[PDB]
């Protein structure tokens, strides 16, 4: 209980402190112009050059990568959606290859709809 | 140099985290029998104000990781052991299969002409065995 | 094939009437 | 009959949920400006005892769904609108593309011999237009 | 605040009540002998035969399906793992087709390891 | 099962229209 | 970048052994 | 190709020494 609360506070301090580090933020803002993957690996190599593996070091890398993926996704929603849809559709085509009667019924339904819409 | 700067910043941030020994005394004081409960209660208090900083999420990830390792250390759970055993055995089956179909270690690197080669692979192996099989024991 | 035409016309009827209800 | 039994049970369970009007007055009283804050605070209280029943998770799913619909109803957010618009436009592009490559509605169902055909597709369309274009207006 | 708490309690009542419904539980236990997908769709058709769509009805179906997937996964971990691994590997093979030097180094490393292990 | 199919398709259609109008 | 590669492979190897021994 | 043999031997050395440290 009390210990739980204490831990809660300590961890909150840490998170709030990483996300409100102003200068790291300026760095992160221009972390890389249109080439994030390479920058991430460069930073990774830089930090683990000492040879001292640490879970703490892993967490920071995780944080940086999340930010990168976030900004990229927000800016590439068209691309993302398009590509996902394409994958799904291609699979369906090849793989999808009483059934017949249901197909006929659905066809009729769709036909009527488009006609009414054009009208 | 900008990459250098960022890297130093990040490493300072992480190492402060792993050297915070108060935090380690608090991760190592939790009951072993009920870790999932404690994890879920901590997350609840952490997101009470509703604020959802991603830095907060990473702290929870750190807590969860440490808890898992402590528990897995005393006892690899039975199904974990099984799943792990099976995955290791599946890897032995596919990998050894091809590695045993392309030829073997020596047959593998023959793609690039000139060493690496069998003569070398066999010499190195012999040396290792010669040194490991007898010298170490005696 | 009267059966199949019937099924298709049923689909058309279905659609038309559904749309009618929704618009009304 | 066992399937029948199960189905009745499930439907009673769900309809009691949608007819619980106290619950609906409480989902419709939340501030529209801060939905995620209230959602995250409710989940926190719900999982305070640590108990993680899957029935509890489904209730949260119900709460989240209702909240989303209320908000989306007043205003389809701009990026939602864009994403939706784009997905609709992508579907128009691929679907119309093939549906316009295999031939069209009539060309589509020709896979199965005997009606459905084109003469029928054109007669039905004409009837629809004839009835919709003029009769409805006048 | 208070309203939040009230909602919390109401929703808890519901969940605890669905999961502790003893007879539904017996039903769910033998819901189906080795053929869950078909039973799920049968139940779906049964419930939505009235024509009254309701989000509440959807939630119950979701609950049933979760239980089904749960029991199946627990009982088919070997199969699951194997198939996932297979997919991943097949993709890697075809797709994976200085690089060379790193490959040589890793090869050397692996060779030594197996030898030491056999020893 | 014809009752089932009809019901399902009609539902999809109604859902489509509602969302479209909301947009 | 040779320092990088060596470090990385060695790490993987050490991790493997630790888990194996724990098992 | 002496270079490549050298790289391979370096890998072998690496592995051997790593395992040695871990066992010791």
Swiss-Prot record, chains A, E:
Post-translational modifications reported in the UniProt record: Ubiquitinated in the absence of XRCC6/Ku70. Ubiquitination promotes protein degradation. Ubiquitinated on Lys-76 and Lys-119. 'Lys-63'-linked polyubiquitin chains on Lys-76 are removed by USP12.
Family: Belongs to the Bcl-2 family.
Effect on the protein upon substituting residue 76 to R: Partial loss of polyubiquitination
Cross-link (Glycyl lysine isopeptide (Lys-Gly) (interchain with G-Cter in ubiquitin)): 76, 119
Record text on subunit structure and interactions: Homodimer. Forms higher oligomers under stress conditions. Forms heterooligomers with BAK. Interacts with BCL2L11. Interaction with BCL2L11 promotes BAX oligomerization and association with mitochondrial membranes, with subsequent release of cytochrome c. Forms heterodimers with BCL2, BCL2L1 isoform Bcl-X(L), BCL2L2, MCL1 and A1. Interacts with SH3GLB1. Interacts with humanin; forms fibers with humanin which results in BAX conformational changes and sequestering of BAX into the fibers, preventing BAX activation. Interacts with SFN and YWHAZ; the interaction occurs in the cytoplasm.
Protein name (database record): Apoptosis regulator BAX
Disulfide bonding pattern of the chain: none
Keywords assigned by UniProt, alphabetized: Acetylation, Apoptosis, Cytoplasm, Host-virus interaction, Isopeptide bond, Membrane, Mitochondrion, Mitochondrion outer membrane, Nucleus, Transmembrane, Transmembrane helix, Tumor suppressor, Ubl conjugation
Entry GO terms, CC: BAK complex; BAX complex; Bcl-2 family protein complex; cytoplasm; cytosol; endoplasmic reticulum; endoplasmic reticulum membrane; extracellular exosome
Complete-protein stretch covered: 53 to 190 of 192
Motif range (BH1): 46-66
GO BP term, pick one: endoplasmic reticulum calcium ion homeostasis
Consequence the record notes for mutating residue 119 to R: Partial loss of polyubiquitination
Substitution effect: residue 15 to R: In a T-cell acute lymphoblastic leukemia cell line; loss of heterodimerization with Bcl-2 or Bcl-X(L)
Position of sequence motif BH3: 7-21
GO molecular function: BH3 domain binding; channel activity; Hsp70 protein binding; identical protein binding; lipid binding; protein heterodimerization activity; protein homodimerization activity
Function: Plays a role in the mitochondrial apoptotic process. Under normal conditions, BAX is largely cytosolic via constant retrotranslocation from mitochondria to the cytosol mediated by BCL2L1/Bcl-xL, which avoids accumulation of toxic BAX levels at the mitochondrial outer membrane (MOM). Under stress conditions, undergoes a conformation change that causes translocation to the mitochondrion membrane, leading to the release of cytochrome c that then triggers apoptosis. Promotes activation of CASP3, and thereby apoptosis.
Presence of keyword Cytoplasm: yes
Comment on protein domains: Intact BH3 motif is required by BIK, BID, BAK, BAD and BAX for their pro-apoptotic activity and for their interaction with anti-apoptotic members of the Bcl-2 family.
Tissues in which the UniProt entry reports expression: Expressed in a wide variety of tissues. Isoform Psi is found in glial tumors. Isoform Alpha is expressed in spleen, breast, ovary, testis, colon and brain, and at low levels in skin and lung. Isoform Sigma is expressed in spleen, breast, ovary, testis, lung, colon, brain and at low levels in skin.
Residues passing through the membrane, by range: 101-119
